[PDB]
């Protein structure tokens, strides 16, 4: 089974990956992004609601350690993580595990996040919310 | 049994916690606020009357150590602590154990306390008393 | 619930605020005026009678510190503060928390106060009393 | 005969142990807790009154050796020990021999005890008393 | 037996203490004020006359050490100390051991004493004599 990835993904045109078809959720096994993916997946379990989970994912992309994310969870409940979306949207600001990995590698102090990545209505330091040019 | 939590609680929409129904008193086992909860519970035993107990709780929220709170008790009598109210009121200034934990983490130098949290009629440093918008 | 604001308010046409309907009392949470609002609320408790409370509010708008206002209170009794009126009147001189915030930021040495803001019959430095063009 | 154990006991769902029925008193022979059990039982003979015996049990849970507990007994009278309660109460703070074994292994510096474990009305270092959520 | 305390005492509404009935004399065992109490009691034995003993008690309240108080005693006779009055009077200036403890902790440079605390007719530095509003 092929894993569908973003058109701007570095996995595009590779064996097991495609842009137009494939699985929309994956831990990206066999790649480096795998680690980021599972970390992101765990975040999505730590915060059940998408808004605060996406806030934690944004903080993760800004370089904050996954361990501090773990301590920030109000409860100690630990459930199995679902694979994160490989194509949450189709614009250049898609918060894929690949993009999060790249942002962490570049150690960016500010990120631009589209509207397909729902965030808290209050300000987040280092995050600028923009309109999603085209969606999934 | 589900534990009733504040609508603004980070435990809302989680297993074992609910906003519309549940237990109104809890030590919040399984969370970090648990520690704060039991500390607040101990305070409510050290000062039997709610007014100066709430004053000591407010001082606890302002960062004062619980050891000094134990020191300030006139007597050395120690009785079992009842669980603190998880929903003392329904406004944004509810002095829940979660809110006290958040204020202690932020190391705030001033807090705003609603009228559902009865306080001494004299001034308390770092505490501003406002009307409770909506009560339990 | 929507908070009713002045037609000339900077919060007009915003989420949670309206000109034609809403709550007439608020601490204006989520805005900067919030701080001014609660300060005004505290003033309205320090002086039970409306006229000298409005005198203290006028002195507050003229840049005088809230701390000095606390010392000027004859007694040390501290009761919970009720939310101040967001629309005391409909003219351009309405002494809303937003207007007081604007006057304090501009550091004005003189203000114009309408008749809907009752003041003591004696002169107040930096305050000019005019008729309220239209009332609530 | 079956020995009734706590719902959170590690002996739950095992041969010879049950959660809903069985003997309420046991030395827990065949398990490791056995040793701790008899120690607590011996404590209950050294101090006839439950309050000071429970204080000594709490100190034993904090890591204090049983030899010092024997030394602290005012008299040298040695009577046969009755088996300790396997389920003193149904909450998570039940002072079972299994819980005491776990606390001693973890070398905890502080314990939380419910109200079903009566203690001296004065403070005990490393022990915090809370209400028992549900009893026998 | 219950120990009667001042209506404004921090021991009011506690086990073993009452406002309307109880023992009028106590060393206040189980409280911190106990220490102050016995010190005050010792003073009352050093100076048999009430006015000069109350002068020494006032000096003790102003922060002067008990060792110097012992030094200033004209004789070296040491007699057993009777428990001090827990309720010398019913006004807010009662010279209870609790009030003396509070004054010593506050390190006040001036105190106000009622007429139910007889003093020498000459001036005492840092002590202001007022009429006792209501007596025992
Ligand atoms: Zn997008
Ligand atoms: Zn409230
Ligand atoms: Zn007007
Ligand atoms: Zn229990
Ligand atoms: Zn008096």
The reply, when asked if residue C58 is annotated as ligand binding, is no
Cα–Cα separations (whole angstroms), residue B90 to B84, D37, D98, E44: 15, 47, 41, 55
Strand partners of residue D85: D25
Q: Could you say which of B10, B13, B30 has the minimum Cβ distance to residue A76? A: B30
Query: Can you tell me the distance from the alpha carbon of B105 to that of B60, in angstroms, rounded to the nearest whole number?
Result: 12
Rounded to a whole number of angstroms, the distance from the CA of B31 to the nearest CA of chain A is: 5
Q: Please, what is the Cα angle at B82 between B76 and B85, to 5 degrees? A: 125
Please give the structure tokens belonging to residue E94. Answer: 């009662």
DSSP C48: -
Give the H or E element holding residue D52: helix D50-61
Q: Are the C-beta atoms of A28 and A34 separated by less than 8 Å?
A: yes
DSSP C63: T
Contacts of D112 in chain B (CB under 8 A): 38
Pairing of strands B17-18, B3-4: parallel
Q: Side-chain half-sphere of B34: how many Cα atoms within 13 Å?
A: 11
Q: Are the C-beta atoms of E126 and E62 separated by less than 8 Å?
A: yes
Pairing of strands B17-18, E3-4: unpaired
Q: Is C118 left (phi over 0), alpha (psi -120 to 50) or beta?
A: beta
Please give the structure tokens belonging to residue B65. Answer: 């150590």
Closest-CA residue to B58 (of B134, B133, B135, B122): B122
Please give the structure tokens belonging to residue E102. Answer: 């509070």
Residues 6+ apart with CB under 8 A from A88: A94, A95, A96, A116, A117, A136
Burial of E128 (0-12, 13-18, 19+ CB in 10 A): exposed
Query: Can you tell me the distance from the alpha carbon of A46 to that of A40, in angstroms, rounded to the nearest whole number?
Result: 10
Q: Are the C-beta atoms of C111 and C127 separated by less than 8 Å?
A: yes
Query: Can you tell me the distance from the alpha carbon of D85 to that of B55, in angstroms, rounded to the nearest whole number?
Result: 41
Burial of C86 (0-12, 13-18, 19+ CB in 10 A): buried
CB of E99 within 8 Å of a chain B CB? The answer is no
Please report where in the chains the tokens 């800004």 appear, as a residue: A62
Dihedral sign from CA coordinates of D121, D126, D131, D132: negative
Q: Could you say which of D121, D128, D133 has the minimum Cβ distance to residue B38? A: D128
Name the residue ranges covered by the structural domains of chain B: 31-129
> Which ligand is located closest to the Cα atom of residue A87?
1
Q: Are the C-beta atoms of D53 and D117 separated by less than 8 Å?
A: no
Please give the structure tokens belonging to residue B37. Answer: 């909860």
Rounded to a whole number of angstroms, the distance from the CA of B59 to the nearest CA of chain C is: 17
Give the H or E element holding residue B38: helix B33-46
Query: Can you tell me the distance from the alpha carbon of D20 to that of D6, in angstroms, rounded to the nearest whole number?
Result: 9
> Which ligand is located closest to the Cα atom of residue C135?
3
CA D98 to chain centre: 8
Q: Please, what is the Cα angle at E9 between E3 and E10, to 5 degrees? A: 100
Query: Can you tell me the distance from the alpha carbon of B6 to that of B23, in angstroms, rounded to the nearest whole number?
Result: 11
Residues 6+ apart with CB under 8 A from E135: E89, E90, E91, E116
| Interchain contact, B79 vs D121, CB within 8 Å | yes
Resolution in units of Å: 2.3
SS3 content of chain C, % helix, strand, coil (to 5): 30, 10, 55
Closest-CA residue to E58 (of E108, E5, E2, E4): E108
CA E123 to chain centre: 19
Strand partners of residue D110: none
DSSP letters, C111-136, are EEE-TTS---SS--TTEEE---SSB-
Torsion angles phi and psi, residue E85, rounded to 5: -65, 125
């Amino acid at each position: 089974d092929v894993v569908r990835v973003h058109p701007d993904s570095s996995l595009a045109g590779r064996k097991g990956y495609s842009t137009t078809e494939g699985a929309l959720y994956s831990y990206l096994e066999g790649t480096r992004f795998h680690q980021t993916a599972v970390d992101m997946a765990e975040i999505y379990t730590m915060w059940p609601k998408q808004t605060e989970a996406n806030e934690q994912v944004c903080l993760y992309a800004l370089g904050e350690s996954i361990e501090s994310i773990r301590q920030k969870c109000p409860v100690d409940d630990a459930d199995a993580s679902s694979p994160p979306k490989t194509v949450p949207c189709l614009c250049r600001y898609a918060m894929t595990p690949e993009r999060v990995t790249r942002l962490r590698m570049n150690h960016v102090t500010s990120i631009i996040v589209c509207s397909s990545f729902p965030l808290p209505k209050y300000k987040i330091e280092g995050v600028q919310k923009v309109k999603c040019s085209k969606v999934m």
